[PDB]
Structures are given as C-alpha cells and as structure tokens.
Amino acid sequence: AQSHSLEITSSVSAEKIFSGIVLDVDTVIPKAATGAYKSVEVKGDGGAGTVRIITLPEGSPITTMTVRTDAVNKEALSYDSTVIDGDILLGFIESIETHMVVVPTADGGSITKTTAIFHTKGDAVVPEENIKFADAQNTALFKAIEAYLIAN
Amino acid sequence: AQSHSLEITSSVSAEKIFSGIVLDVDTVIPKAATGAYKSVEVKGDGGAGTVRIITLPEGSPITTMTVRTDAVNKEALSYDSTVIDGDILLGFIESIETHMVVVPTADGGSITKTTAIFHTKGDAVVPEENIKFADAQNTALFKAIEAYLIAN
Amino acid sequence: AQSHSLEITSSVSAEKIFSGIVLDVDTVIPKAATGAYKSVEVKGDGGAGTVRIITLPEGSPITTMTVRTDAVNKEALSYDSTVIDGDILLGFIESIETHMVVVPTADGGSITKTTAIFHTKGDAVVPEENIKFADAQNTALFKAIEAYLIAN
Amino acid sequence: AQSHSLEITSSVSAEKIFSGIVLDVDTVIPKAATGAYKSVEVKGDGGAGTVRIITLPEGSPITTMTVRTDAVNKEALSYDSTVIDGDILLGFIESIETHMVVVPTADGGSITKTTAIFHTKGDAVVPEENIKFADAQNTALFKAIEAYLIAN
Amino acid sequence: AQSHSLEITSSVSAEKIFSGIVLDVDTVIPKAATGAYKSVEVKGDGGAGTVRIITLPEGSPITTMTVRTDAVNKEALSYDSTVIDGDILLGFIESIETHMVVVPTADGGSITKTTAIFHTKGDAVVPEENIKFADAQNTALFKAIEAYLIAN
Amino acid sequence: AQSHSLEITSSVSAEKIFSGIVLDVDTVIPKAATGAYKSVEVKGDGGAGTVRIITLPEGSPITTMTVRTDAVNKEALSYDSTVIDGDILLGFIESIETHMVVVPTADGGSITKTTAIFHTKGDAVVPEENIKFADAQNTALFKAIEAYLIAN
Ligand SMILES: [Cl-]
Numbered sequence: 007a008q009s010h011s012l013e014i015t016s017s018v019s020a021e022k023i024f025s026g027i028v029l030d031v032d033t034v035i036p037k038a039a040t041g042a043y044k045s046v047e048v049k050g051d052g053g054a055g056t057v058r059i060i061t062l063p064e065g066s067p068i069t070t071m072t073v074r075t076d077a078v079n080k081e082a083l084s085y086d087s088t089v090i091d092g093d094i095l096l097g098f099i100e101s102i103e104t105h106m107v108v109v110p111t112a113d114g115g116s117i118t119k120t121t122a123i124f125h126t127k128g129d130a131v132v133p134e135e136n137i138k139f140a141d142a143q144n145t146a147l148f149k150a151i152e153a154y155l156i157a158n
Numbered sequence: 159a160q161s162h163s164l165e166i167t168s169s170v171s172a173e174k175i176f177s178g179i180v181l182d183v184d185t186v187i188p189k190a191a192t193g194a195y196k197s198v199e200v201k202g203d204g205g206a207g208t209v210r211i212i213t214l215p216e217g218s219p220i221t222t223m224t225v226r227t228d229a230v231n232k233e234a235l236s237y238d239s240t241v242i243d244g245d246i247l248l249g250f251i252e253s254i255e256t257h258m259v260v261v262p263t264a265d266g267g268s269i270t271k272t273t274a275i276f277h278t279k280g281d282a283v284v285p286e287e288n289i290k291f292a293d294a295q296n297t298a299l300f301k302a303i304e305a306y307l308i309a310n
Numbered sequence: 311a312q313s314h315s316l317e318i319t320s321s322v323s324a325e326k327i328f329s330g331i332v333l334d335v336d337t338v339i340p341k342a343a344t345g346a347y348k349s350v351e352v353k354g355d356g357g358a359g360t361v362r363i364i365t366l367p368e369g370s371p372i373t374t375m376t377v378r379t380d381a382v383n384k385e386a387l388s389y390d391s392t393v394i395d396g397d398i399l400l401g402f403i404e405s406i407e408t409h410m411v412v413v414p415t416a417d418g419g420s421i422t423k424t425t426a427i428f429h430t431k432g433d434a435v436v437p438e439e440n441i442k443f444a445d446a447q448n449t450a451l452f453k454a455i456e457a458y459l460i461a462n
Numbered sequence: 463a464q465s466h467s468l469e470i471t472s473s474v475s476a477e478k479i480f481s482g483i484v485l486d487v488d489t490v491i492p493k494a495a496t497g498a499y500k501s502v503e504v505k506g507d508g509g510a511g512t513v514r515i516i517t518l519p520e521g522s523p524i525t526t527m528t529v530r531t532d533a534v535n536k537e538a539l540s541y542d543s544t545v546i547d548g549d550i551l552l553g554f555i556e557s558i559e560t561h562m563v564v565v566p567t568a569d570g571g572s573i574t575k576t577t578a579i580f581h582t583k584g585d586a587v588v589p590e591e592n593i594k595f596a597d598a599q600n601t602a603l604f605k606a607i608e609a610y611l612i613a614n
Numbered sequence: 615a616q617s618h619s620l621e622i623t624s625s626v627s628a629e630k631i632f633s634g635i636v637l638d639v640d641t642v643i644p645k646a647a648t649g650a651y652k653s654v655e656v657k658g659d660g661g662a663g664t665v666r667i668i669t670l671p672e673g674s675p676i677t678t679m680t681v682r683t684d685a686v687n688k689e690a691l692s693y694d695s696t697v698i699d700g701d702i703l704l705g706f707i708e709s710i711e712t713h714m715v716v717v718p719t720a721d722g723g724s725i726t727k728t729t730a731i732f733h734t735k736g737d738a739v740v741p742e743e744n745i746k747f748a749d750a751q752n753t754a755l756f757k758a759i760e761a762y763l764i765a766n
Numbered sequence: 767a768q769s770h771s772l773e774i775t776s777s778v779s780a781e782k783i784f785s786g787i788v789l790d791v792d793t794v795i796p797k798a799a800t801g802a803y804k805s806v807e808v809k810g811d812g813g814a815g816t817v818r819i820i821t822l823p824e825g826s827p828i829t830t831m832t833v834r835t836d837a838v839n840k841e842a843l844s845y846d847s848t849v850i851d852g853d854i855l856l857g858f859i860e861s862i863e864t865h866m867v868v869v870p871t872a873d874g875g876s877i878t879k880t881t882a883i884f885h886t887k888g889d890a891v892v893p894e895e896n897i898k899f900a901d902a903q904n905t906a907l908f909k910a911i912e913a914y915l916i917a918n
C-alpha cells in the first residue's frame with residue numbers, strides 16, 4: 007500500500023504545537039490562517055468519530071475534503087485521521103489514512119511526523135506531484151499556526 | 159548591527175521559486191494565499207525603487223508594513239529589499255534590510271537564503287520571539303506559493 | 311530540565327530499523343547481541359505499560375536498569391520510554407524520559423532520532439561522561455541489530 | 463540555453479569581496495595571484511564596455527580569453543560580463559554570458575553567486591568536465607584574492 | 615581490485631581509541647564486548663606477523679575468521695591487517711587486505727578510517743549486502759570499545 | 767593546545783585528489799600553480815622524514831616555510847606533516863602539527879579533512895586572522911590542483 011511521510015521541524019515545544027494543530031485547531035485556524043478555509047462543518051467534539059467537512063475557495067486545486075478523526079492521544083501527542091471524501095481523492099483514491107505524532111527535541115522544540123497511507127482501487131498510483139502539493143500546503147498551514155502560537 | 163538568516167528548502171527549482179516569490183508575486187499571492195493580505199498598494203514595476211504598502215487583517219499581530227525593493231537580479235535569482243515603515247517596526251526599528259538569493263541544489267530543487275539586518279536606534283535589540291514570528295510567517299507564505307507552483 | 315539528543319544514521323529502511331529496535335527487540339537482541347544482556351524480565355506485550363527489568367554482566371559500569379514503555383506508534387515509527395530504576399540512575403536521577411522517532415531518508419535509509427530528558431533532584435546535573443557512555447553503548451547495540459537485519 | 467551556477471562562501475564581507483574581485487581586480491591580482499596571468503590588456507575604466515584581453519602561461523589548458531564588462535553596480539555588488547573570444551570558447555561556444563552578485567550573510571560574511579549561460583552554435587553542449595574545470599580555477603583565483611584581503 | 619572504505623567518528627581522542635581497538639584489544643574486548651567472541655587464539659605479540667584465529671557463536675552469519683597483522687605503527691596510529699581464512703571469505707574471496715588509520719580532529723576527538731581491498735578469484739564481485747554487514751558489525755564493536763574507554 | 771580544522775569538498779575522487787595534493791605534488795604544483803612558489807628544496811623521497819624548504823615571492827605575507835612529512839599512508843589516503851621553521855611561525859609558534867585525511871563521498875567525490883594543532887610558547891594564542899589566511903591560501907592551492915586533475 008503506497009505511503010509517504012512528512013517531517014516538520016519547529017522551535018516551539020511539542021505540547022504547544024499539538025495544542026495548536028490538533029486540540030484547539032477549530033478556534034486557532036480562523037485567527038491564524040484567516041482565508042485558508044471557505045467553511046468548516048464540525049460534527050463531534052474533536053475526539054475519535056469526529057468528522058469535519060472542509061471547503062476551500064472557488065478556484066483552489068482542491069476545493070473539498072471530508073476528514074474523520076480515528077484517534078487522539080493528548081498525553082502522547084498523537085493524532086490519527088482519515089480523508090474519506092472530496093475532490094482531494096481525485097477520481098480513484100478510496101481513502102488517505104494518516105498517523106501523526108509530535109515528538110520533543112533536545113533544544114526544547116519539536117518534530118511533527120506524519121505518515122500517510124493511500125488506499126486506491128487496483129494498482130492505481132498517486133502521482134508524486136499531488137503528494138508534493140499536499141506537503142507544501144500542510145506545511146504552509148502548520149507554519150501559519152506556529153506563527154500564531156509564538157505570538158499568543 | 160543585529161542580523162539573522164533564514165533558509166528554506168524546496169523540491170521546486172530555483173528559477174521557478176524565484177518567479178513565484180519575486181517576479182510574479184503580485185498575481186501569484188492572491189491565487190496562492192487568498193486571505194493572507196487585506197490589501198496591497200504597489201508603486202512601480204517590481205524593479206528597484208518599487209514600494210509596496212501592505213495591510214494585513216484587523217486582528218493580526220502585524221497589521222501594516224511598507225517594503226521598498228532595492229535591487230532585483232533575474233539572472234542571478236537574487237532580491238534585495240528594505241522594510242521602511244509599519245507597526246512591524248515596533249516602536250524602535252529604523253529599518254529591516256534584507257538580502258535574498260535562491261540557489262539550486264544537486265537534486266533539481268533549491269534553497270532560498272535570506273539575511274535580515276535590523277537597524278535600530280541606539281543599542282536596542284530586536285527580541286528573539288519577534289524574529290521567530292517573522293520566520294514562521296515568511297515560511298508559511300513561501301510554502302503556500304510553493305504549493306501553487308507545483309500545481310500550475 | 312537537562313536534555314540530550316542522539317542521532318544514528320543507517321542505510322537500512324525506517325520500517326525495518328523500527329521493527330528491529332522496537333517491535334521485535336525481545337527475540338532480536340539474543341540473536342544479534344548474544345552476550346550484551348545477562349537477563350531480561352518482560353512484564354507486558356510490548357505496548358504502553360510494558361516494563362522490562364534488564365541486568366547486564368557482573369563487572370559492567372551499569373549493572374541494572376528498569377525501563378517502562380510509555381507509548382508505541384507502529385505507523386509513525388515512534389517509541390517513548392522511561393528509565394525508572396537501576397544503578398543507571400546513579401545516586402540522584404529520578405528518571406530518564408526518552409522519545410524516539412525513526413525517519414526515512416531520500417536514499418532509502420533512515421535516521422533514528424532520540425531525545426533524552428533527565429529529571430534530577432534539585433539542581434543536580436548529569437555529567438557529560440555518563441551521557442557519552444550511554445550514547446556509545448546505545449549505538450553499539452543499534453549497530454549490532456542493524457547487522458542482524460542486513461543478514462536476515 | 464545551457465546554464466550553470468557557482469556559489470562560493472567566504473567569511474569576508476560582501477563589500478570587501480566585491481572590491482577585491484571586481485573594483486580593484488587589476489591591481490589586486492598581480493599582488494594576490496602573482497603568476498596566474500601571463501599578461502592583461504585592459505581597454506577601459508572597469509565599467510560597462512571595458513574589455514580585457516587575458517593570456518595565461520604557455521602550457522595551460524586555456525591560454526587566452528577576452529572578457530567584456532556588460533554592467534557594474536557598486537551599490538548592489540553585482541557584476542555582469544561576457545567571454546567573447548579565446549581558446550576558452552573551444553571550437554564552438556559563441557559566448558559565455560555571466561552574471562554575478564555578492565550577497566551578505568548573517569555571520570558578517572558573504573556568498574558570491576555566479577550564473578553562466580553558454581551560447582553555442584546549434585544543439586552543441588558544453589561538457590561537464592569543462593564546466594568543472596572553470597569552477598575549480600575561478601574558485602582558486604577567488605580564494606587567492608580572499609587571502610590577500612584578509613591580510614591587507 | 616574491488617575496495618571499500620569505512621569512517622567512524624568518535625569524541626574520544628585518537629591516542630586513546632588506537633590503544634583500545636589495536637594495542638590493548640585482547641584484554642579490552644572481553645571486558646567491553648563480553649559475548650561478542652566465542653574464542654580467540656592469538657599467535658604472536660600484537661606486532662607484524664601476529665595471527666589471530668577468531669570464532670563467533672554457533673548461529674552467527676560469520677562463524678570463523680583468521681586475521682594476520684601486517685604492520686603496526688604506534689606513533690602514527692596506523693594498523694594494517696589481512697583476513698586470510700574463515701567462512702568470512704564466503705566461497706571465493708582469497709583475502710581481505712585492510713589498512714586503518716586513526717586521525718585526530720580539532721575538537722579533541724578522532725576519525726578512524728579503514729580501507730578494505732577484496733582480492734577475489736577471477737571477476738567475482740563481493741556483494742554490497744556483505745560489505746554493509748561487515749560495516750555494521752565493526753561499528754558495533756568499535757562503539758562497545760568506545761564505551762569501555764569513556765568509563766575507564 | 768589550540769587547534770583548527772578545515773574541510774574542502776571536491777567532485778574529484780579521493781584517490782585522485784590524494785595523488786595530486788600529496789603523492790605527485792612536486793611535479794603537479796609547477797604545472798598547476800605556476801607562480802605560487804618561488805622555489806622548493808626537497809630533501810627526501812616524499813615519505814616520512816622528508817623535509818621541504820619552501821619560499822614564496824618577495825612581497826608575500828608569508829615568505830618562508832619549512833615542512834616535515836611525519837607520515838604517509840597511500841592506502842588510507844592520510845598525510846601527516848609539521849611546519850617547523852619560517853616566518854609563517856610569526857614570532858612565537860614552536861610548530862604547526864597537521865593531520866590530513868581524504869574521505870570519499872556517495873556521489874563519487876571527496877572531502878579533504880585537515881586538523882592543525884598550534885604549539886606555542888606559554889599561553890600565546892594564534893589570532894583568528896592568521897588562521898583564516900592559511901585556510902584561504904590552502905584552499906586556493908587545493909583548487910588550482912583540482913583544476914589540473916580535472917584537465918589531465
Ligand atoms: Cl510506498
């Protein structure tokens with residue numbers, strides 16, 4: 007099963023990053039990345055079973071994605087979620103299973119590792135350009151949130 | 159004179175990154191980072207002497223900055239510019255002189271290297287938290303642009 | 311809180327290294343490092359809450375250590391564990407909290423990144439010689455396991 | 463059009479490097495690299511339109527090159543020049559267009575970036591060995607000049 | 615003639631490493647890597663002409679090797695030796711000629727470089743997996759010895 | 767004892783670099799760096815005990831240096847040598863002990879790593895400007911030789 011990993015380094019602590027990009031994401035993103043999202047429907051409290059229907063602006067390469075939270079561990083700073091619907095799946099991705107952990111570093115900062123596993127119909131391969139796009143955009147959002155955390 | 163450098167790695171080529179984050183920035187940013195800016199007044203063609211008056215949304219930690227372009231070298235992929243006004247200067251920074259160069263990497267990607275020099279009144283020091291904030295936000299914008307370049 | 315990090319590079323893949331030095335460690339170490347341990351009592355299945363009582367040979371500089379597993383993430387290749395007892399704590403270390411992540415490299419190999427945080431009574435500092443010793447010994451064991459993985 | 467770039471790092475400041483390798487080159491090279499050149503005819507003052515006819519010693523792989531200055535910017539530390547004649551062109555290079563900029567670094571040093579563009583007849587490609595040779599020899603001369611600047 | 619080199623970095627000084635991995639190896643290894651060897655017959659004093667018959671535990675991928683010392687230089691920290699018998703030679707390696715030097719580093723540590731030259735019958739090539747195995751196992755033993763030196 | 771290290775990267779292989787900057791240096795330098803030296807008296811064959819009396823042109827910041835070869839290892843690509851006389855020692859340096867190793871890189875190139883140890887009378891410190899000068903000049907000569915190797 008095709009997979010990919012993304013590592014993002016930060017000088018901000020693991021506890022604080024995790025709070026920004028997982029626990030408090032719904033109130034943080036509108037203050038941190040003011041126009042990134044067109045709208046977000048949140049069904050659930052943020053723990054397992056929570057489903058978010060996200061919509062990006064009209065012209066964007068990806069306009070819609072639906073993301074289900076599979077597991078949260080506040081003590082271990084880990085988050086598991088699956089993309090289950092939207093044009094993000096292109097014509098042929100059944101689901102994008104993701105597993106994230108935020109680990110501390112000796113300098114008091116952190117590394118946020120994410121592993122993505124792409125479940126596709128048959129032998130269909132997700133092209134490298136689409137994976138790079140996702141990495142850029144996820145890093146963009148991460149860093150916008152890092153900026154908000156450093157200032158608040 | 160207090161100084162700081164920021165390096166950002168990308169899998170996109172040096173020529174392409176430079177076109178996105180310097181040459182075509184005025185048409186790229188509205189498509190790439192749709193809400194990042196509230197408004198931009200551009201006085202000039204993008205070459206030396208060009209002055210941009212930038213305004214961010216109401217709540218933001220930095221609401222206004224005025225940036226002058228000192229030099230552009232399309233062939234060398236370098237860009238020099240100075241922040242000369244705005245609440246970005248806090249109470250006491252006279253100007254933020256910056257020098258950027260995009261250098262290619264063996265893998266066909268690039269490293270964008272920026273040096274910032276802070277000119278202050280007297281012995282006043284710019285605190286580390288404000289520098290980290292700038293780095294986070296500049297990286298966020300860089301990566302939003304990288305995403306747009308990978309897709310177009 | 312005093313901290314230290316250790317990075318170990320390997321030409322073996324991230325998935326494979328993680329399986330050797332975390333998932334399958336209890337059957338791998340007796341085949342890979344035949345005399346390294348005098349004995350191991352394992353209480354638990356290898357996941358969170360698992361506690362290992364380890365004893366090294368009679369003369370060794372460290373003769374006993376008790377290590378608790380705090381978290382395992384098989385998908386993210388991260389492992390968190392705490393040293394809670396043994397003469398490894400010298401007279402005065404309350405616990406050694408560790409956080410490990412195995413990250414892949416462009417060449418198909420990996421870097422195993424570990425952060426250790428030393429909790430001590432009062433202002434007591436763990437000397438550099440003891441930290442270097444730990445690094446040497448952990449690397450020795452890592453590489454013995456790497457050898458076993460390359461051959462099997 | 464085939465192109466190549468060379469980056470050379472130095473601990474010496476950008477202003478000072480530029481003065482050594484561009485502004486004062488004609489008096490610096492005879493003191494810094496005493497035997498490097500056999501002779502230099504300089505037609506012009508060092509600004510745009512200046513043409514230098516350079517001759518290296520009898521046995522050298524490259525014996526002659528003629529270099530025209532296209533542009534100098536003393537404030538921006540940039541220099542543009544074209545190689546227009548000599549056995550450096552081999553049988554088939556029409557001209558070697560070069561663009562150099564010296565950028566400052568946070569540590570008070572500098573990076574000297576040069577982009578070379580090779581204009582050839584038809585689809586003729588300049589081999590990698592010839593480009594590496596040029597890089598070695600230009601770096602050799604740069605560093606000889608760096609040495610002179612550090613001492614004077 | 616097929617060859618390979620291995621570089622191992624250490625924070626321990628060159629003199630001290632050399633004493634551990636060459637001069638005092640016969641008394642150090644039993645204290646440092648208690649189970650690594652099953653037995654060692656040493657014929658000679660440790661200088662040129664010395665021959666060691668080494669046997670590893672029953673299951674190991676390599677069970678036997680015979681190593682001849684070709685040259686020792688205590689002042690220069692260099693050691694030359696040849697593997698001349700054992701299942702380490704697989705079916706077809708005539709001998710493994712090795713040359714080691716321990717060089718000091720500015721930080722007071724050292725780099726131990728080893729060059730191995732594989733003499734084989736005909737055009738037979740030693741596979742990359744076997745060379746990686748050797749590197750892992752030699753590094754494992756090196757680091758076990760480093761640990762002993764740091765503690766004694 | 768005060769020390770310093772210098773690393774020089776090259777795209778040329780380790781074997782070839784070593785042959786140019788150690789083994790064949792006496793015939794290579796007159797072809798590669800035609801005017802660098804005024805004269806060289808060589809006493810010995812190039813191996814241990816060899817002593818070179820070197821004289822640079824009249825004006826140069828360093829006019830004379832006497833260098834003894836302490837050790838050569840052709841197989842390991844290491845070279846040890848000591849500067850024992852000349853105005854290079856300024857008023858007060860007793861000797862400059864150097865240790866060089868050329869190590870190969872994954873890309874088929876090399877890194878030449880040199881450690882210099884300055885033995886001085888009393889607590890006398892060698893200033894940073896003199897060390898930087900030496901680095902510039904040694905790099906200049908290295909790269910002139912690299913150029914000759916790429917062409918021959
Ligand atoms: Cl895959």
Ligand SMILES: [Cl-]
Pocket residue numbers: 009010011414
């Ligand atoms: Cl990957």
Ligand SMILES: [Cl-]
Pocket residue numbers: 018019022
């Ligand atoms: Cl923090």
Ligand SMILES: [Cl-]
Pocket residue numbers: 007125126
């Ligand atoms: Cl599947």
Ligand SMILES: [Cl-]
Pocket residue numbers: 159160161
């Ligand atoms: Cl500073």
Ligand SMILES: [Cl-]
Pocket residue numbers: 161162163568
């Ligand atoms: Cl900095």
Ligand SMILES: [Cl-]
Pocket residue numbers: 170171174
């Ligand atoms: Cl591209």
Ligand SMILES: [Cl-]
Pocket residue numbers: 159277278
């Ligand atoms: Cl100033």
Ligand SMILES: [Cl-]
Pocket residue numbers: 311312313
């Ligand atoms: Cl600390």
Ligand SMILES: [Cl-]
Pocket residue numbers: 112313314315
């Ligand atoms: Cl550390």
Ligand SMILES: [Cl-]
Pocket residue numbers: 322323326
């Ligand atoms: Cl593998």
Ligand SMILES: [Cl-]
Pocket residue numbers: 311429430
């Ligand atoms: Cl604490």
Ligand SMILES: [Cl-]
Pocket residue numbers: 463464465466
């Ligand atoms: Cl090209």
Ligand SMILES: [Cl-]
Pocket residue numbers: 262465466467
């Ligand atoms: Cl290039």
Ligand SMILES: [Cl-]
Pocket residue numbers: 474475478
């Ligand atoms: Cl300077």
Ligand SMILES: [Cl-]
Pocket residue numbers: 463581582
């Ligand atoms: Cl053309």
Ligand SMILES: [Cl-]
Pocket residue numbers: 615616617618
């Ligand atoms: Cl080979």
